[PDB]
Amino acid sequence: NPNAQLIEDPLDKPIQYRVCEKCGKPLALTAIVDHLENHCAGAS
Ligand SMILES: [Zn+2]
Description:
Elements: E1 17-19, E2 26-28, H1 32-38
Antiparallel strand pairs: 1-2
C-alpha cells in the first residue's frame, strides 16, 4: 500500500519565459498575468 509512497501527478508542462521589455525580468507564462497587472511603467 502507498503509505508514504506518492504517485506524483505528471506535470509535463514546460513553462515558457520571456523577459518583460520594460522591466527586464524573465516572465513565465504562469506569472505573465500577475506581473503585467502589478508591474509599474518605468520600473527599473
Ligand atoms: Zn514588467
